[PDB]
Amino acid sequence: HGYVEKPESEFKDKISSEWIVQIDPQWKGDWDGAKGDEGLVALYKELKDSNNAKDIRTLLDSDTKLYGANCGYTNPDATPEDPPTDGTATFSRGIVHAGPCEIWLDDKMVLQNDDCQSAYGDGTQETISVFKPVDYSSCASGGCMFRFYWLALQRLDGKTYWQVYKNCIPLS
Amino acid sequence: HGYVEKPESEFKDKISSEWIVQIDPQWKGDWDGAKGDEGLVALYKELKDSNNAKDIRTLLDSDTKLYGANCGYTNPDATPEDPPTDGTATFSRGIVHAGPCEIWLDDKMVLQNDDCQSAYGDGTQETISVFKPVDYSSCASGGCMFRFYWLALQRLDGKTYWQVYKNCIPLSGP
Ligand SMILES: [Cu+2]
Ligand SMILES: [Cu+2]
């Protein structure tokens, strides 16, 4: 759960920290047989390779009925805001689910990791997750759309689920 | 997870300890706000009272799309077997989810609890769950269908779900 807080996510309607969808894994594999967070991540990395996938955006953007609405619950129509000046993005809390995440500035993939839980925080909810480094130089011209993608790999009584989080924030 | 082991569940095809369905709570209430297993059970009891429900079978039988196929993955047309002789039924493992369960022999409800995790075992998977007491006397003349229902109350990241478990086992008379 959570949303990007810097830059500040905006909502048209209700504020929500929830995933946009929560579905069965769509890449065929032995998801249920993986040993814990490290197992889910390791399997993800293995399936990423054999599906020939360079990033999660391509997958998550390919079908909004299966992978959820563009921008999730966030509002791309919001008043654009100034990019951060410190080369970071900040989540609204600590990431406590394993899985890959990505930041794009328009068509430029500026940050990517197979397990953002370990890369950008300490796995506790208390420690704010800080996405860094982020180069916002491509935005200084005429702005950009900041897009955040996160695929959390989750378990409920032995069964693995994919949770999809999407945020969009316009920058000037 | 699990299935009734005594009497012995027979499976239509694949053997499965899984629920037949897993769905949003269908009774409106503050399911996500309940504090743990104790809270989930306490909330069930309140909504049971206000929905005027005497059992879970009526609800779970009312819509077999929403609440899953009759008999789950089990075969009610298996060779009938002799009822247990010791006034008990045995689960295939220990129950480790909170929530109500009940046992019917045809239209007779012979066991019910709002929280079978605490009533019929110790909350560990290792300790086998044993439903008791069960009176099988109605099966003597002409056999009976044994039905097990269980509504498990589960959380996944602050969101509550209902898991529905159903087993049917045919028992013989003399
Ligand atoms: Cu979450
Ligand atoms: Cu289970």
From TrEMBL, chain B:
Cu(2+) 2 binds at H1, H97, Y165. Cu(2+) 1 binds at H1, H97, D157. The keyword rRNA processing does not apply. Keywords: Metal-binding, Signal. GO terms for molecular function: metal ion binding. Disulfide bonds join C71-C168, C101-C116, C139-C144. This is Mucin-like protein. It comes from Phytophthora sojae (strain P6497). The chain holds residues 24 to 197 of 278 of the full protein.
